[PDB]
Amino acid sequence: PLQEMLAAPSSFKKSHVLSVTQFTRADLHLLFQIAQEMRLGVQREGVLDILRGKVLCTLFYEPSTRTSASFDAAMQRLGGRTIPIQTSTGETLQDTLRTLANYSDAIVLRHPDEKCVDVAKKYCPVPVINGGNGSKEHPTQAFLDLFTIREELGTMQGLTITFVGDLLYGRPVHSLVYLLRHYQVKVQLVSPKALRLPPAVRQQLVDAGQLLCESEALTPEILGRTDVLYCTRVQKERFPSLAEFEAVKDSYRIDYSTLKYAKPTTVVMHPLPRNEEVAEEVDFDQRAAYFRQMRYGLYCRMALLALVMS
Amino acid sequence: PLQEMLAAPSSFKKSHVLSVTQFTRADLHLLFQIAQEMRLGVQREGVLDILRGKVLCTLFYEPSTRTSASFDAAMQRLGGRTIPIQTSTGETLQDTLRTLANYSDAIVLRHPDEKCVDVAKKYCPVPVINGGNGSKEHPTQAFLDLFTIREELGTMQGLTITFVGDLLYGRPVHSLVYLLRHYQVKVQLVSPKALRLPPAVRQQLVDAGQLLCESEALTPEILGRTDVLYCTRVQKERFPSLAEFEAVKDSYRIDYSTLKYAKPTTVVMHPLPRNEEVAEEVDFDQRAAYFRQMRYGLYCRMALLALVMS
Amino acid sequence: PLQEMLAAPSSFKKSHVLSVTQFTRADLHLLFQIAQEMRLGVQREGVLDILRGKVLCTLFYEPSTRTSASFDAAMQRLGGRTIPIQTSTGETLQDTLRTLANYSDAIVLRHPDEKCVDVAKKYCPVPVINGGNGSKEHPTQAFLDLFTIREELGTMQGLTITFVGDLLYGRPVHSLVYLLRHYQVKVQLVSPKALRLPPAVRQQLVDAGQLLCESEALTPEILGRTDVLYCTRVQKERFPSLAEFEAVKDSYRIDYSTLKYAKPTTVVMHPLPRNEEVAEEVDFDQRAAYFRQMRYGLYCRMALLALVMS
Numbered sequence: 017p018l019q020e021m022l023a024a025p026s027s028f029k030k031s032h033v034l035s036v037t038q039f040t041r042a043d044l045h046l047l048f049q050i051a052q053e054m055r056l057g058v059q060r061e062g063v064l065d066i067l068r069g070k071v072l073c074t075l076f077y078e079p080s081t082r083t084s085a086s087f088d089a090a091m092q093r094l095g096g097r098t099i100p101i102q103t104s105t106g107e108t109l110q111d112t113l114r115t116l117a118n119y120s121d122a123i124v125l126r127h128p129d130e131k132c133v134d135v136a137k138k139y140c141p142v143p144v145i146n147g148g149n150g151s152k153e154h155p156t157q158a159f160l161d162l163f164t165i166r167e168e169l170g171t172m173q174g175l176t177i178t179f180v181g182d183l184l185y186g187r188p189v190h191s192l193v194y195l196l197r198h199y200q201v202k203v204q205l206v207s208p209k210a211l212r213l214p215p216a217v218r219q220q221l222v223d224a225g226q227l228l229c230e231s232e233a234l235t236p237e238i239l240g241r242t243d244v245l246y247c248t249r250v251q252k253e254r255f256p257s258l259a260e261f262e263a264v265k266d267s268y269r270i271d272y273s274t275l276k277y278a279k280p281t282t283v284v285m286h287p288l289p290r291n292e293e294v295a296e297e298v299d300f301d302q303r304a305a306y307f308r309q310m311r312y313g314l315y316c317r318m319a320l321l322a323l324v325m326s
Numbered sequence: 327p328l329q330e331m332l333a334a335p336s337s338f339k340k341s342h343v344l345s346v347t348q349f350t351r352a353d354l355h356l357l358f359q360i361a362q363e364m365r366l367g368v369q370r371e372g373v374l375d376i377l378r379g380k381v382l383c384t385l386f387y388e389p390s391t392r393t394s395a396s397f398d399a400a401m402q403r404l405g406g407r408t409i410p411i412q413t414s415t416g417e418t419l420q421d422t423l424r425t426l427a428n429y430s431d432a433i434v435l436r437h438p439d440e441k442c443v444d445v446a447k448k449y450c451p452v453p454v455i456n457g458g459n460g461s462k463e464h465p466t467q468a469f470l471d472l473f474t475i476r477e478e479l480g481t482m483q484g485l486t487i488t489f490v491g492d493l494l495y496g497r498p499v500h501s502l503v504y505l506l507r508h509y510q511v512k513v514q515l516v517s518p519k520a521l522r523l524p525p526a527v528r529q530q531l532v533d534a535g536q537l538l539c540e541s542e543a544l545t546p547e548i549l550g551r552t553d554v555l556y557c558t559r560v561q562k563e564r565f566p567s568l569a570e571f572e573a574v575k576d577s578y579r580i581d582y583s584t585l586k587y588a589k590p591t592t593v594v595m596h597p598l599p600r601n602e603e604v605a606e607e608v609d610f611d612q613r614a615a616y617f618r619q620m621r622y623g624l625y626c627r628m629a630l631l632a633l634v635m636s
Numbered sequence: 637p638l639q640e641m642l643a644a645p646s647s648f649k650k651s652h653v654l655s656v657t658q659f660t661r662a663d664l665h666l667l668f669q670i671a672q673e674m675r676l677g678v679q680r681e682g683v684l685d686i687l688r689g690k691v692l693c694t695l696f697y698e699p700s701t702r703t704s705a706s707f708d709a710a711m712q713r714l715g716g717r718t719i720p721i722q723t724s725t726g727e728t729l730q731d732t733l734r735t736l737a738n739y740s741d742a743i744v745l746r747h748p749d750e751k752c753v754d755v756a757k758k759y760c761p762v763p764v765i766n767g768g769n770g771s772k773e774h775p776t777q778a779f780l781d782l783f784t785i786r787e788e789l790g791t792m793q794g795l796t797i798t799f800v801g802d803l804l805y806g807r808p809v810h811s812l813v814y815l816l817r818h819y820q821v822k823v824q825l826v827s828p829k830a831l832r833l834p835p836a837v838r839q840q841l842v843d844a845g846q847l848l849c850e851s852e853a854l855t856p857e858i859l860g861r862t863d864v865l866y867c868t869r870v871q872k873e874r875f876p877s878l879a880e881f882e883a884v885k886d887s888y889r890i891d892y893s894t895l896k897y898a899k900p901t902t903v904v905m906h907p908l909p910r911n912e913e914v915a916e917e918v919d920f921d922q923r924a925a926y927f928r929q930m931r932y933g934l935y936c937r938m939a940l941l942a943l944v945m946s
Contacts, residue, residue, distance in 0.1 A: 062379025062431070063407060069682025071709055081417075082425050085409050089381055089429035092407040097683060097712040099705050102412075102722075107701075107909045110916075115702050115908070118931040119709035121682070139919075288425070289417045296420075299449075311428040372689025372741070373717060391727075392735050395719050399691055399739035402717040412722075598735070599727045606730075609759075621738040 018053040021046065022066070028323035034133040034146040036155045036191050041198045048163050050319035051312075058093055058318075066322045067096035073120035074100045075112065076147065077127045082288060082310060083147050083157075087124045090317040096325075105129075110139040117142045121325055125149075143324050151187060156320060157287055158191035160313035165244055167312055168283045168305055172199040176241050179203065180234055180268050181248035181293060184211040188287045189248060193217055202228040204238050208264055211254060234268050236277035245270065245278065246285040247293055271295035275303065285309060328363040331356065332376070338633035344443040344456040346465045346501050351508045358473050360629035361622075368403055368628075376632045377406035383430035384410045385422065386457065387437045392598060392620060393457050393467075397434045400627040406635075415439075420449040427452045431635055435459075453634050461497060466630060467597055468501035470623035475554055477622055478593045478615055482509040486551050489513065490544055490578050491558035491603060494521040498597045499558060503527055512538040514548050518574055521564060544578050546587035555580065555588065556595040557603055581605035585613065595619060638673040641666065642686070648943035654753040654766040656775045656811050661818045668783050670939035671932075678713055678938075686942045687716035693740035694720045695732065696767065697747045702908060702930060703767050703777075707744045710937040716945075725749075730759040737762045741945055745769075763944050771807060776940060777907055778811035780933035785864055787932055788903045788925055792819040796861050799823065800854055800888050801868035801913060804831040808907045809868060813837055822848040824858050828884055831874060854888050856897035865890065865898065866905040867913055891915035895923065905929060 027043050057064045072091040076084050084100065091098045099120060103112070109132060116123055122143040125136055130150030137144075148154045169175065177196070179189050183205055190213070193203070203226050205213060212218070212230070221227040231238060239245075247270060255261035269292060270284060286294055286306040298304050337353050367374045382401040386394050394410065401408045409430060413422070419442060426433055432453040435446055440460030447454075458464045479485065487506070489499050493515055500523070503513070513536050515523060522528070522540070531537040541548060549555075557580060565571035579602060580594060596604055596616040608614050647663050677684045692711040696704050704720065711718045719740060723732070729752060736743055742763040745756055750770030757764075768774045789795065797816070799809050803825055810833070813823070823846050825833060832838070832850070841847040851858060859865075867890060875881035889912060890904060906914055906926040918924050 062381070071682070071712065073705065073709075079413070081411060081413060081422065085383065085411060085426060085429055088409050089383075092381065092409070099708050099712070100410075100720075101701060101705060103699070103701060111909065112701065114919075114927045115930055116705060118927065118934055119705055289421065299424075307424045307428065310425055314428055372691070389723070391721060391723060391732065395693065395721060395736060395739055398719050399693075402691065402719070410720075599731065609734075617734045617738065620735055624738055 018050070018057065021050050021053060022322055022326070026323050028320060029326060030143060031324060032137060032144050032146075033155055033320065033324060034137070034144070034149075035153055036158050036194050044159065044162065044195070047159065047316065047319050047323065048166065050322060051163060051315040054318040054322070055315045058315075063093050063095055065095050067091065067094040067325055070094075070096040070325050071120040072096055072098050072122055072124065072321065072325075073116050074098065074124045074147075075103070075116060075126070076101070077103055077105055080126060080148065083126065084124075086310065086313050087145075087147070087317055087321075090314055090321055093314075094318055094321055096321070110135050113140040113144070122321075145320070145324070153191060154188060155191065156313065156317055157188050158195050159320070160309060160316045161188065161192050161246075161285065161287070162195045163316050164285060164305060164309050164312045165283065168308070169243060169281070172196075172201060175199075175201045175243040176228065177201055177203050177244040177246060178206060178238060178242040179246050179248070180206045181250045182211045182254055183207040183213045183248065185254065186248035189246065190214070190217045192246070193220055196226070197224050201226055204229040204231065204242070206231050206234045206238060206268070208232055208260075234274070239274065239277040240279070242278055242282050244283045244285060247290075248287070249289070249291055250293055251291075265292065269293055269295060270298060272297060275301065278303070328360070328367065331360050331363060332632055332636070336633050338630060339636060340453060341634060342447060342454050342456075343465055343630065343634060344447070344454070344459075345463055346468050346504050354469065354472065354505070357469065357626065357629050357633065358476065360632060361473060361625040364628040364632070365625045368625075373403050373405055375405050377401065377404040377635055380404075380406040380635050381430040382406055382408050382432055382434065382631065382635075383426050384408065384434045384457075385413070385426060385436070386411070387413055387415055390436060390458065393436065394434075396620065396623050397455075397457070397627055397631075400624055400631055403624075404628055404631055406631070420445050423450040423454070432631075455630070455634070463501060464498060465501065466623065466627055467498050468505050469630070470619060470626045471498065471502050471556075471595065471597070472505045473626050474595060474615060474619050474622045475593065478618070479553060479591070482506075482511060485509075485511045485553040486538065487511055487513050487554040487556060488516060488548060488552040489556050489558070490516045491560045492521045492564055493517040493523045493558065495564065496558035499556065500524070500527045502556070503530055506536070507534050511536055514539040514541065514552070516541050516544045516548060516578070518542055518570075544584070549584065549587040550589070552588055552592050554593045554595060557600075558597070559599070559601055560603055561601075575602065579603055579605060580608060582607060585611065588613070638670070638677065641670050641673060642942055642946070646943050648940060649946060650763060651944060652757060652764050652766075653775055653940065653944060654757070654764070654769075655773055656778050656814050664779065664782065664815070667779065667936065667939050667943065668786065670942060671783060671935040674938040674942070675935045678935075683713050683715055685715050687711065687714040687945055690714075690716040690945050691740040692716055692718050692742055692744065692941065692945075693736050694718065694744045694767075695723070695736060695746070696721070697723055697725055700746060700768065703746065704744075706930065706933050707765075707767070707937055707941075710934055710941055713934075714938055714941055716941070730755050733760040733764070742941075765940070765944070773811060774808060775811065776933065776937055777808050778815050779940070780929060780936045781808065781812050781866075781905065781907070782815045783936050784905060784925060784929050784932045785903065788928070789863060789901070792816075792821060795819075795821045795863040796848065797821055797823050797864040797866060798826060798858060798862040799866050799868070800826045801870045802831045802874055803827040803833045803868065805874065806868035809866065810834070810837045812866070813840055816846070817844050821846055824849040824851065824862070826851050826854045826858060826888070828852055828880075854894070859894065859897040860899070862898055862902050864903045864905060867910075868907070869909070869911055870913055871911075885912065889913055889915060890918060892917060895921065898923070
């Protein structure tokens with residue numbers, strides 16, 4: 017049933033996983049199927065059998081424990097072997113990739129240079145998974161985000177999604193807008209005017225018939241119609257004047273006074289790490305899904321690794 | 327026989343392991359039984375079968391190779407999988423614990439903040455083993471210490487234990503006094519007056535009918551009645567005047583001129599690392615047990631991991 | 637057939653691997669046999685069975701991803717378990733070795749002090765593999781180098797080997813000269829006069845009837861008779877005057893204008909890392925063997941680990 021679904025055909029098999037723009041609605045539907053199966057297999061036996069004999073190497077030039085350990089644990093729970101590497105940007109990336117390709121069957125790469133995906137494509141002779149390229153894309157983060165929504169709420173039809181915070185530099189938002197192109201959702205965008213979406217991402221939303229509201233304020237009416245409250249970090253450097261920055265924090269902080277205006281079923285998401293824009297007092301609330309996000313990311317990356325490495 | 331003893335009931339199963347004050351004489355007797363079995367299993371097959379399908383994550387905010395690699399090797403020799411994380415104290419500990427709990431079935435945590443155990447108790451949804459909380463407790467170090475004594479000398483009745491060095495800041499001593507509450511031992515305490523035991527730990531000893539001698543000098547008579555010479559590091563910062571500090575080093579240094587006054591059967595212990603308070607010239611001496619300590623700690627942590635994770 | 641060849645007798649079994657001067661022509665012939673078998677086993681099943689139940693610990697005091705990950709991947713592909721340690725030169729090496737010997741069945745050690753091999757011999761109770769001792773020796777690098785030549789060109793009789801660059805501080809060259817003592821090869825040595833071989837290594841070559849040419853220039857005639865072009869890094873510190881250093885770079889740089897004077901079958905080798913002394917424009921050329929080197933090193937280290945740990 018799982019050996020079945022992994023028998024199926026996919027763009028993932030033997031492929032680099034560098035951008036969400038490589039994958040179709042069907043690609044992701046199959047992936048999410050396999051991720052449900054992965055969750056069942058693990059719930060019963062802990063470490064499965066899919067990838068005995070396969071070696072994954074993780075190559076992180078900047079540390080991101082959530083992502084690197086997620087891939088480590090996914091590979092090992094597939095029954096594969098992992099080689100975790102920590103380094104910093106003097107040997108070039110293309111030399112390191114070609115070095116490590118001789119040891120492993122695939123590499124997860126996170127690197128401060130967004131052109132790293134291009135280097136990986138030109139030089140690396142094994143599949144590379146893009147674990148973050150200068151903060152431009154992080155495709156499995158987009159995957160696990162979409163999956164989180166599906167899993168927590170059921171069908172995508174009818175949903176209203178509210179992105180809050182820094183939507184200019186918040187690329188996980190942009191990647192997720194792309195993945196939502198296939199769905200009859202409405203979207204609200206709460207941000208200062210200085211940090212609205214890039215005009216082309218906004219244009220992606222109006223083109224799909226999805227842009228509902230744009231607002232600088234996180235209001236009880238916006239909150240009352242939110243099925244999904246996807247928050248982003250808002251860093252002080254994005255503002256010239258500190259006063260502005262704190263005004264915007266206090267406005268956007270998800271705490272109990274903010275959740276009271278929400279729905280009983282509102283899913284609160286966050287790619288993490290967070291500063292104070294989601295209060296700790298909310299972590300135990302059923303609607304707080306940002307730790308369940310990471311267990312969903314476990315099952316999605318098991319599926320992705322199974323598909324890429326057969 | 328081992329599947330038998332792991333069938334048995336214990337406070338360890340599914341529990342946080344944060345303090346020695348959580349465990350009874352029976353708890354530790356069972357643990358030591360299982361540790362003897364672990365040593366046999368490993369002596370014959372290297373990597374056992376107990377914890378296939380289980381994932382342990384080690385989370386060390388300060389490096390301690392002896393402890394982190396001991397737990398890595400214990401888990402893997404149980405047939406489980408390990409995810410070793412190195413980080414430093416900006417994401418909070420409770421967020422990191424909840425992140426990693428989605429990947430592993432338990433976490434070993436070492437952290438500079440002694441309140442970390444409380445954080446782990448409030449937030450973490452998988453068992454946490456306390457690998458050292460701001461140097462206040464290190465329970466498996468206490469376990470392997472008691473086990474070391476048992477293993478090297480047989481029965482605890484009749485023993486004289488001599489703690490030497492810095493007994494104020496030497497908490498492994500305090501934890502071990504607690505674990506020795508059950509035993510008819512006598513204890514000698516050699517330290518400067520500035521670094522005697524905390525009055526309550528001393529009071530724990532007189533209450534048990536165990537305090538034999540307190541001395542600022544490491545004397546041939548104290549040495550002649552020592553079954554166990556447990557040394558601690560003496561750091562220069564614990565003294566205002568350098569002269570005092572070196573006087574105390576030279577007095578307490580375990581070398582050949584000091585061992586000659588000891589028994590042929592005196593077990594010399596040290597939690598490690600050491601500076602010069604145990605001379606290298608003594609390392610090959612049969613009585614030098616501070617490297618055998620760590621192989622005993624291997625078997626004890628295999629037992630503890632087997633019990634906690636079933 | 638592999639269980640056969642590992643049944644055979646070898647100086648490797650249970651031995652420290654510290655110097656090329658420990659091993660005979662037969663030792664290396666057997667090793668290369670087993671490495672061919674390792675390549676076949678892995679090509680069909682990924683992770684083999686040879687060393688289930690064995691634990692290897694890697695202990696690198698300076699990072700060298702190519703070497704540490706090569707040994708990690710070799711052990712794991714033998715079916716053993718690995719414990720990778722990263723540290724820096726306050727606990728002594730002999731204390732760390734004795735600590736870790738209680739957890740693993742062998743240790744790969746790389747350390748800035750060339751005397752580390754002596755420390756390892758005096759104190760460590762498990763086999764130690766020398767992964768680099770203050771840049772004096774790196775024996776498995778020599779092994780994989782010789783194997784690379786054999787594999788790419790067939791029989792050693794008739795070959796001309798040309799070492800280029802910094803032959804004084806290039807010890808992999810010296811180790812490889814030693815390993816070539818058994819073979820009817822000719823050797824050319826291209827280097828500035830300031831960086832010729834040590835007189836005793838040169839004397840090793842004339843004693844074997846092998847020194848063909850010594851030159852400060854990399855000439856079309858030297859290139860035309862090169863079967864193996866083994867390049868070394870040339871670092872700016874080896875020259876007082878920058879002008880000299882760049883003159884020597886430009887002279888020695890392997891690029892297309894330099895390869896045109898070579899043979900169609902010239903194997904270009906490099907221990908790596910490289911600066912600019914092999915141009916990127918050459919990496920895709922069939923003759924560029926410095927990434928295949930590392931896959932050969934994978935199979936050689938699998939063989940060496942299998943032999944040392946039975």
